[PDB]
Amino acid sequence: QFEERHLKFLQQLGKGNFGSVEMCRYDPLQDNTGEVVAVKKLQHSTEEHLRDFEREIEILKSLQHDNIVKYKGVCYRNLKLIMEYLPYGSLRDYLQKHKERIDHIKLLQYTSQICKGMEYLGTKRYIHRDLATRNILVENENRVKIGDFGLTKVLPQDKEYYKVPGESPIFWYAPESLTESKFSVASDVWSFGVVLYELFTYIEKSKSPPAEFMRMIGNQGQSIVTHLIELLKNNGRLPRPDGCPDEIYMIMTECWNNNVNQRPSFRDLALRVDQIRDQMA
Amino acid sequence: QFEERHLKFLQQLGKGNFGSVEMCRYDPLQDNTGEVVAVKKLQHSTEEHLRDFEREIEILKSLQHDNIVKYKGVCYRNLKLIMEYLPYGSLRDYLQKHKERIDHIKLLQYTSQICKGMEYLGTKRYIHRDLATRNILVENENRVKIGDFGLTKVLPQDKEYYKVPGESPIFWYAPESLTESKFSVASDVWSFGVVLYELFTYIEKSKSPPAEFMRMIGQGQSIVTHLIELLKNNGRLPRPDGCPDEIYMIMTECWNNNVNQRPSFRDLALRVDQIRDQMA
Numbered sequence: 128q129f130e131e132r133h134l135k136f137l138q139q140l141g142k143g144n145f146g147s148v149e150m151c152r153y154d155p156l157q158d159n160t161g162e163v164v165a166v167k168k169l170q171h172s173t174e175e176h177l178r179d180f181e182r183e184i185e186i187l188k189s190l191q192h193d194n195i196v197k198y199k200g201v202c203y204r205n206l207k208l209i210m211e212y213l214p215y216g217s218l219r220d221y222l223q224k225h226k227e228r229i230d231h232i233k234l235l236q237y238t239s240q241i242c243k244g245m246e247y248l249g250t251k252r253y254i255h256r257d258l259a260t261r262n263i264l265v266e267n268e269n270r271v272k273i274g275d276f277g278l279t280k281v282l283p284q285d286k287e288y289y290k291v292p293g294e295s296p297i298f299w300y301a302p303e304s305l306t307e308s309k310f311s312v313a314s315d316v317w318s319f320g321v322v323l324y325e326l327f328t329y330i331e332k333s334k335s336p337p338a339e340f341m342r343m344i345g346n347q348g349q350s351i352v353t354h355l356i357e358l359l360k361n362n363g364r365l366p367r368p369d370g371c372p373d374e375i376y377m378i379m380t381e382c383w384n385n386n387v388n389q390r391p392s393f394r395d396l397a398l399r400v401d402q403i404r405d406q407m408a
Numbered sequence: 409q410f411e412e413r414h415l416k417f418l419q420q421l422g423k424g425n426f427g428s429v430e431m432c433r434y435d436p437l438q439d440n441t442g443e444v445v446a447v448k449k450l451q452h453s454t455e456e457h458l459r460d461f462e463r464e465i466e467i468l469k470s471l472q473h474d475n476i477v478k479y480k481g482v483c484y485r486n487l488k489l490i491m492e493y494l495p496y497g498s499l500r501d502y503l504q505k506h507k508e509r510i511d512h513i514k515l516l517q518y519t520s521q522i523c524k525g526m527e528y529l530g531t532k533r534y535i536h537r538d539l540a541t542r543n544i545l546v547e548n549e550n551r552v553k554i555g556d557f558g559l560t561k562v563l564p565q566d567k568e569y570y571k572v573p574g575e576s577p578i579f580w581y582a583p584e585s586l587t588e589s590k591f592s593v594a595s596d597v598w599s600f601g602v603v604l605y606e607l608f609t610y611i612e613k614s615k616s617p618p619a620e621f622m623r624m625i626g627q628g629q630s631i632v633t634h635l636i637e638l639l640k641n642n643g644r645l646p647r648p649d650g651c652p653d654e655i656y657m658i659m660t661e662c663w664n665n666n667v668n669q670r671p672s673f674r675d676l677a678l679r680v681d682q683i684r685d686q687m688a
């Protein structure tokens with residue numbers, strides 16, 4: 128599909144999860160005028176990592192949706208995934224930099240697009256396992272997409288969960304992810320609640336999930352994951368962001384229910400968010 | 409390393425396993441004087457088949473041994489594996505055509521070189537899974553090599569077997585390959601016994617493994633099912649006419665139901681070399 132000799136490195140866009148994304152120009156005519164693209168590649172490659180990356184590529188190839196980064200092709204352990212280039216970058220850095228120009232209505236537009244991306248994911252029985260503002264990308268002021276599927280897994284044909292590791296974003300994890308490594312649509316719903324908290328805290332570092340959970344845990348001879356599991360069991364939850372509307376915080380608190388089956392659906396979350404936004408406007 | 413524009417098709421050498429090998433000349437100076445080579449390519453290309461072929465290429469790249477066809481390079485999915493050209497072709501067809509000029513001593517020379525190729529494979533924790541006279545190639549009257557690695561697999565770091573499956577040469581398969589799809593050095597040893605039977609039957613069609621097993625099978629059920637029952641009951645290929653006792657004894661030990669009672673390729677190498685030395 129894409130040749131390596133025509134792939135012109137421009138700058139580093141993201142790194143992590145044994146992977147990196149690079150802004151490249153595909154210039155097969157050598158004029159400096161080709162199309163800018165995103166190139167994901169493996170770091171510390173292993174046959175195991177390469178197998179996961181091949182599955183990642185196939186997962187994104189099956190996805191066509193306005194709120195999911197667009198698969199373009201592949202370039203032939205030097206395997207590279209080629210995607211569209213979203214110019215405004217991660218929502219996390221975009222919100223942190225443009226917060227003064229972003230009101231609650233815009234946050235709901237972002238939240239609505241994430242839900243619709245997750246609902247679509249639902250229809251293919253895919254679990255993201257990494258839903259966070261750092262894995263969401265800004266295309267334009269009116270459009271966000273989910274931009275990485277490095278931990279995404281296909282549910283088995285006979286189960287509603289996948290059991291899975293390495294370093295993990297424990298402050299976004301559902302109780303049953305922490306204790307039994309069980310990942311489900313309902314675990315993505317719990318993480319979407321943390322994404323809503325991130326958006327309404329405007330990525331303020333003092334208020335970040337790791338900051339708030341660490342203050343609640345205290346400053347023992349035990350692991351942070353151990354303390355966090357106890358805090359979640361005792362109904363320890365992230366606080367209401369300053370000025371967060373009650374209907375939005377109510378949505379967060381329902382996403383963070385200990386019972387998997389009492390968590391809302393992404394379809395219900397879509398509808399609720401769209402209507403709250405309609406009310407505000 | 410190799411460009412397609414300089415790859416000149418000459419003749420078809422082999423086809424099978426969703427793959428084909430072609431005799432090509434690499435003529436970059438366009439004089440018809442370049443080096444003749446073997447080019448393997450995929451047929452019914454599937455990303456999965458492409459992934460298997462990429463691993464096959466890497467497997468052959470890691471192999472350098474007198475009794476293993478030489479990796480030369482790759483040509484870019486139209487991804488093509490380039491190997492040396494062995495001019496006398498597959499041992500199966502060579503033996504079938506030259507049997508009147510080939511005595512038991514020569515069969516032992518062929519058998520010895522296969523064992524040494526398989527032992528080398530052993531050292532890399534590779535299992536061939538397709539050991540047969542059709543995957544052996546003749547370079548000269550004194551040298552043979554294993555020529556295809558289309559089904560070859562790297563053992564996991566923590567296990568002595570690999571569990572795998574399309575159309576398969578069931579009449580070369582070990583009981584535990586048929587029943588549980590388990591492949592091992594010991595499964596390659598079982599197949600080596602069938603290769604020894606092929607060589608000593610001089611590839612006579614009336615005596616082929618599929619011929620003999622089919623006569624023994626005689627239904628209601630699948631051939632694979634009958635074959636599993638025949639092997640469980642100690643149904644085995646017969647002694648080739650004229651096959652020395654030591655050679656047949658080597659076959660019967662290779663075809664032990666118990667994986668761990670099968671000889672090693674190092675033991676088989678030594679035994680074959682000495683029997684050839686005794687025959688002079």
Ligand SMILES: Cc1cnc(Nc2cnn(C)c2)nc1-c1cnn([C@H](CC#N)C2CCCC2)c1
Nearest residue numbers: 140141142143146148165212213216262274275
């Ligand atoms: C896929 C993609 C497409 N366009 C852009 N555009 C961009 C980025 N920065 N700017 C200024 C402009 N970025 C990415 C991109 C970078 N990182 N990611 C992953 C996280 C997410 N989503 C990382 C890759 C390594 C692991 C997670 C996606």
Ligand SMILES: Cc1cnc(Nc2cnn(C)c2)nc1-c1cnn([C@H](CC#N)C2CCCC2)c1
Nearest residue numbers: 421422423424427429446493494497543555556
């Ligand atoms: C790799 C190779 C190198 N040189 C030659 N020389 C040759 C062949 N015929 N003659 C007259 C001369 N042949 C091959 C060759 C052809 N087929 N194979 C595989 C089976 C085996 N071993 C096939 C490939 C597709 C499925 C298995 C190797």
